[PDB]
Amino acid sequence: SMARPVSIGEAVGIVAAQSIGEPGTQLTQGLPRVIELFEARRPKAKAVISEIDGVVRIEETEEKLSVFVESEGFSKEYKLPKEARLLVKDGDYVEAGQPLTRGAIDPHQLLEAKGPEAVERYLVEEIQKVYRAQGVKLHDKHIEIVVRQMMKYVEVTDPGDSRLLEGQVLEKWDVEALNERLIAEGKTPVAWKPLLMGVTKSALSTKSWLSAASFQNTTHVLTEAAIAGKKDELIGLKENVILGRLIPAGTGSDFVRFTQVVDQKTLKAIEEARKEA
Amino acid sequence: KEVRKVRIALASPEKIRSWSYGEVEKPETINYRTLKPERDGLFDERIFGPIKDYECACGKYKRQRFEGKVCERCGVEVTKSIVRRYRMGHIELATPAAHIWFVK
Amino acid sequence: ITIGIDDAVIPEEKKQYLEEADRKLLQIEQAYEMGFLTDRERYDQILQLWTETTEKVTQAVFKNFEENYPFNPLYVMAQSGARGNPQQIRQLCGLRGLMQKPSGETFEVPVRSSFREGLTVLEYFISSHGARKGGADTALRTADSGYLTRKLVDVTHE
Amino acid sequence: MVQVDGGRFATSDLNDLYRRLINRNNRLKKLLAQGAPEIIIRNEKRMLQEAVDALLDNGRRGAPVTNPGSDRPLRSLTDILSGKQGRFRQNLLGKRVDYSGRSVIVVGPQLKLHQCGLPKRMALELFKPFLLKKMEEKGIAPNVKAARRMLERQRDIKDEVWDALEEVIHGKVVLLNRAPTLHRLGIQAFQPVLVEGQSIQLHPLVCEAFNADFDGDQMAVHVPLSSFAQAEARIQMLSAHNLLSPASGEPLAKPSRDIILGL
Amino acid sequence: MEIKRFGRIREVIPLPPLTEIQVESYRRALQADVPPEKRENVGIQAAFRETFPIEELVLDFLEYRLGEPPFPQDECREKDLTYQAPLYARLQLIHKDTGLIKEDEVFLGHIPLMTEDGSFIINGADRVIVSQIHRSPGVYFTPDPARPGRYIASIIPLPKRGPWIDLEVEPNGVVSMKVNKRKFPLVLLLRVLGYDQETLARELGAYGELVQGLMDESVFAMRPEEALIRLFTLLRPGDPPKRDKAVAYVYGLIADPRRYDLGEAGRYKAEEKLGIRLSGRTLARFEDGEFKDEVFLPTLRYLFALTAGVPGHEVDDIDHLGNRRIRTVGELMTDQFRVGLARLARGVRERMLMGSEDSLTPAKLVNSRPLEAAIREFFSRSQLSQFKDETNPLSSLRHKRRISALGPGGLTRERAGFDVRDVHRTHYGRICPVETPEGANIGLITSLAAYARVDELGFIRTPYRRVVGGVVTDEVVYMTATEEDRYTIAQANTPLEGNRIAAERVVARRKGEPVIVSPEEVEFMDVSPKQVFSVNTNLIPFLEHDDANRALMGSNMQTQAVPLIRAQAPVVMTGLEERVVRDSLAALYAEEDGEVAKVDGNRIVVRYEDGRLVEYPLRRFYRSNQGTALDQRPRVVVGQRVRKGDLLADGPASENGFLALGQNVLVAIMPFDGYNFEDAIVISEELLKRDFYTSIHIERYEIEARDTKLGPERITRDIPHLSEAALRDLDEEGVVRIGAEVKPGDILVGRTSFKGESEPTPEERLLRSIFGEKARDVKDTSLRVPPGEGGIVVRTVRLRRGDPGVELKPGVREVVRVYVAQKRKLQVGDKLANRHGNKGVVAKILPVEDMPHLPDGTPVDVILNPLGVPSRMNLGQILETHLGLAGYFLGQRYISPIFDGAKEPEIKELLAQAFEVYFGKRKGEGFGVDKREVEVLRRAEKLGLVTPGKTPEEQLKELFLQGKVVLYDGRTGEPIEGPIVVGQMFIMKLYHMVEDKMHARSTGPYSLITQQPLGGKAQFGGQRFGEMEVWALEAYGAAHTLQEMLTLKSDDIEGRNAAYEAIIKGEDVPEPSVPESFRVLVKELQALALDVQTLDEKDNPVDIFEGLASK
Amino acid sequence: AEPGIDKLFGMVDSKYRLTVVVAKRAQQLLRHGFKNTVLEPEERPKMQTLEGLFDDPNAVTWAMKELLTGRLVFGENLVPEDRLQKEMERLYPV
Ligand SMILES: [Mg+2]
Ligand SMILES: [Zn+2]
């Protein structure tokens, strides 16, 4: 909206959510498919992709369609029903992540196969496919923002030398900071696994107890407020609104919250009165 | 100054009594005939301060000239009445009870 | 810029295209009489035929407007992009096309007329289905859209 | 617990909860003071835990206790905090507001882009305190009270008060708004110009940005108060400085139906 | 004047009584006329038959009778009561043993009575009941969703008369009964109803694949009563399974006609479906203690025959109109009455077990409270009991003929799908496909079609002519959808040569499908195209050139019209504009022939041919439900004969028996200086000069005076600190005198209130003691005008406690109600429409000389944007405009019926004659062509509009036949650069205006609870501020605006007080420190035994209260 | 549009810094009632009435004009604000 490098301290995420949800009132697969891709749940036409590279060796019995992805030493076999409209042929060497039949992809399979990055690229591609199919122009930037927010949470596989526990969930930043401190503390770093979770769960599992307390399931998350014994940091916006505080954005950003102004002449007089002492 | 972090934690009965200006005893809020808040009740002004500014309920001072001194003839001191907003009492139980949230 | 009823000009190729559609429908039913095809593919070919003739008469309307009346206000509104799609201009001059059932299956008989030539009662009773569907879809759509925006801004709020 | 005009007391149920707790508590103090048989001691402690439960949350265990002669349950502390009408959700997200107004809209073609029309009644009823201060700052009324009770009568509206009103709005800015606001252009800033009638005039080139048309759509109008809020409005939220979509960067103040038609 | 007609279709039947559904249903439900021995088993009579006797010493029922209202209808609505009659019942408490027959005539409360027109008067409010559609009872078959080759057999009784019945196929081959969300076998019930392996294999042996799958002999081991104990353990686990308890229980659920009933219509549908004939309307027959057969084995055979693919066995669509039935008002009050009777039945069953068994009058055996409370609750707070709308006569008519699916026993807004909103294949001629509200209520709320009648069974019947050979008859039979489903009905537009059909290959619906048929197989024919749509939709002329969307909006918008004080009938009508005025029960018509005797503005005396001298009073200046003037202007003069049915007096929104909603205004279609942009409409000052679009609205106010324990309230001419200069309009008792105008805030009723005891501020008390205005024992409770309103007081009403037939809530001494009217003209910012849905708000009134004008100097009055047309596909307004042009230049009105009306060449003929009578006339005074029209003519022939080479006169003729004439802008004199279309159009004025919309607030009152500013535009407050607006503000990041929005302009106290103080001090408003919401949240959290530690960045515990209320 | 707004964006790198600059400057000019300006009489924001021409009462116009001149040094931590306030009150009282 200004055709220029963005000013420091602007709140991207609210603009992002508004720009995403604005033309959703002009959608007739449509809005449930959009919700599905935001929920990352179990799809309907659950296609099967490759997981280990190798050639495709189809096997067509009249009642069963099987396929064999065949590496130098790994023949992984998949068994498909007859209605599965394929994407490949026999004698085709395909990559992991690449799908075999038509239909959408569950994202957890792609998380297993190709890590988080192709997951993010696939989600961006799907949402842009829907929105360009309906004829609505939208920069991918906001979708990138929210999907980066979606992949934030990580799982503690094994704690190692840490104070924390296994199977524990946290932010990627915290495990990264504590791991680089651990290798700066002579102790072993923690092993963490990247963990895709749904959008409502992504808002649910946050550390800022005020925002999630106010948010929803307010009874038991208020019992979580009773649980807490923690401190808050007032990083987001919702907590500053609910406490009525000056929000930390725009004019309220701490980069510009204390910018002095003065004239020339009386500034010079004050500085001269300073330097004479 | 200014606030930067907010820490939520448990309670403790000593700090409960630290916040409590006193004790509440009567099951009456205010009157119905006279509409007066009764003494040592829920709306008792000698706990939670007066309703109007710089006045005691006996009538010793009606002016800004004094501040904070407790007029003994009613029990309310001389102040701004908005300390009604920020003031708690307590009730000492005869037997301890469970904050039911940790139960429920 | 005014609108007259004579501005909705009907090109004469409409009925000739309809004659070709009539004799092709005749031939399709004749091939069904010998059992030379199923009724399924008959339905499919009929949908195909009506769709192709619909596109043809839309092209005929637009080249007629560009030929004879370039300052006709309806075609001016169309090319300017201020108001109007080509399909609305076809419904005002050519034929409405085909509508479908509440099951979504398309009727095997199209609306032969525009709005300018009037409609038979049955055609109005047909097109009411799609009109009701569109209104119901919008009235369903609004609140769920606001709901989506709510969840999104709740998760990205920082 | 306050007195309504009908004699009733608009009363929080917490007062009733505190009363029942104080009653049962001092009763059991008196009961232990004498050395009662233990059965009623156990029953009274049972009622004590029940009462303090109801105070913390009427509506967890068993029947949520009501008043005698009422089916409706009470409102506990959890009912105060949580819920759609609680503190956390409600009392900071979604409220009412002073210094506001509501009307219907109508096109005004002759305006510039950063202007909007205000009915004289509405601008009178909105900028009242500034008008009071300026009327005292002129020789029209000595204090605020004379100016107040001389604006009390609509016969007294001379022409000088209109001159003061058009003085005090010089460079002031108001906010236009239409429910429901999808994106951030749903609220705009505008400089006001006084007009006649009982309707808010509007520039054409912004109505499609509002996704608003003149089929009878209503409108809300607010006014910032602090000079900080004035600058916050006049730099960012002014319509003349907002031309491109934050969505994808296209001119939302593009021309429209009749304009494109004429060109 | 000339009233031309059109159309080539002559109908054979007229329209029925339009409101006959409501009044006919209730009049059937009452039977208040008939002697009691002929009261058939229906409604109140049927309910009294079924719920009696009481069985516990036995009391049974003889008959009932209806009393009389103590007050007439206008008196009842004056005193704000319920128009009702008491109901009395002749009763015989008969002990079987001692033969004591205590006979009495008990009193059983009141029953609300219908008005003449079909409304109800409840507490003075005008209400109405809307019919409720639902699924019909009986038996149905649906495809099983889980097992695709299988089906589910459903049996559904009357609503609230027991649960449904699900016959299901288990995965093995046995079939099972699912009742009360529970599965259990079916051979169990066969054994209970006496069906061994013998009978099952003997009759159902054709398909043993599920009958031997059904076979099991362990149930044939146990007898029906042991099977009954077994199923009592099954369906009621954790219960003592006595045989007597089991017999009584499953009799009460299966063979009880008192708590269970299959629908009589559902019984008829089952009898038609299975071909069998039922004895009763229950599931079993309680005989010999056991039960005997009703309909178990034909349904099982149908289920297996459909399972085996036998022809003549078909699943049934639940949304098909042969399977859904309507419930009128009479069924609803019958069922509510049945609920109240069952309540009093169990009440007296309680009461029968107490008391001395001899000294019992039956009057002292029954209460009347629960039944009267049931009926009163149903008429007051139920969902179907709508507050009846009376904006115009047509709106009341449409609200009378509404049809819902919502309410009790229906559907909720969450669980609403799409097919419930969809138009079925068989709505043709039974439900209007286009008349419905939009929004969330779309597809559910609707109205009846025009020629549609309802049977006693609840099925919509529809008229059709028979066709015999190639001859259509003149009789006509009503049918349902089911009887329509076995024929081939041609359309009504098909040409006829006498009764011989003129066409060759007809279009027809076979099973609702379009098909080209020979004339021989035509069995039936539609009556008229008017049988398709509703009465609102049948008003819109040229419906065959408008999209369904704008037709929907126009058909709904006609209800929101407002009656005008100089109203007009439209110049283009559809013929139906008199039957609606006749059956609306608004205007006044002559019953008998005779002569007009006395004409006055309040009453009409007529000498009849009988010689009975009859005077009708005239309801004059009547306030509507929504503040609309209603009156009956007279229409005749003394010394003038009448006929049976002539118009005597003009009702509201009517003219000479024709419907009159808007005005016929000249209008051209062109964009004008941006004022037409996005649907805004421009007018001239000529309309306001000749009082066009002017309305009258009566606003009613109210004030109660009651008894206060702090000293009761009194109403007088004196209140603390009132100048008499602000009081010169009251009477001596206190109310204003009739005739005075009033501005906002001025006193209507001066009411005292005896003061309590509290504290005023010392400075203003010092002001009162220094100025010279002391206080009294009382304080003010005066009724003043809410702001923005105002006008003339017309009528006052002063009720009191101590008057005959006044019934008030306790405490009230007296109440005052004041009627204030105002005459609203047309200003900027009001909302107009015409019949094709092209609506919009008016934008800019202009002086008349700016407006364009015809060559004769006649100016146009309304301007319309053209660009709202082609994205809407509503072309009918253009044909309306052409016809209105012809009718303007010839002075004549026209009738074009729906789908059979004036096409193009007839309009071309009429425009040719109109061009003659215009241009030859203006030529007749020696005024030829102008230069300006010559220039625009040759510019027009550069656009292919007229063929060139002609004289200007013939080209002008061609343009007039096109419906475009030249024009001259009044602002600048030169012609417009193209020919413009222009003609007359019928244009209404909508109900809502800015007066109950526009309000604004600086400061003022606050919440007595939450310290917020007030809410609602009636109560002076400010706007709702939704959270999406907060999101927009954060997207701009204007932070201080948000913080001052959350406290300073809202429920903060000290901040807003300091802000107002600084503004009247004239500086910048400062910034608050600790948040008010922050502080109260901290104290709420500390109330929850939870310490909250407000920190700085360096863990120093910062106080936010400054030690104010902390030790 | 406010005049020179593109050149005003040319001055400060961040628009929010510009906003808080003009807000604080307007607050100063209101608290010392326009006698502590940097402008000239011809640089004063005029306002045309039926009586004539007068100085504008809206401080924000003055602040934008002053920032368009270039006599206002701004930034962060040029001086502690308290001594600025004391010597501003001392040099420029009411
Ligand atoms: Mg609208
Ligand atoms: Zn007291």
Residue numbers in the entry:
A (entry chain D): 1210 to 1237, 1254 to 1502
B (entry chain D): 3 to 106
C (entry chain D): 947 to 1104
D (entry chain D): 527 to 789
E (entry chain C): 1 to 56, 64 to 1118
F (entry chain E): 2 to 95
Q: Could you pull the original sentences from the published paper?
A:
The cryo-EM structures of MTC with and without ATPγS (MTCATPγS and MTCapo) were determined at 4.1 and 5.0 Å, respectively. As expected, a clear density feature for ATPγS is observed in MTCATPγS. Although full-length Mfd was used, cryo-EM densities for only the RID and the TM were observed. The RID binds to the RNAP β1 domain, while the TM binds to the upstream dsDNA and the clamp. Compared to MTCapo, TD2 rotates by ∼33° toward TD1 in MTCATPγS. ATP binding then leads to the closure of TD2. Superposition of TD1 with and without ATPγS results in different registers of TD2, which are offset along the DNA by ∼1 bp in the direction of translocation, suggesting that the step size of Mfd is 1 bp. The interactions in MTCATPγS will be discussed in the following sections due to its superior resolution. The RID binds to the RNAP β1 domain with a buried surface area of ∼579 Å2. TD2 binds to the clamp with a buried surface area of ∼580 Å2.
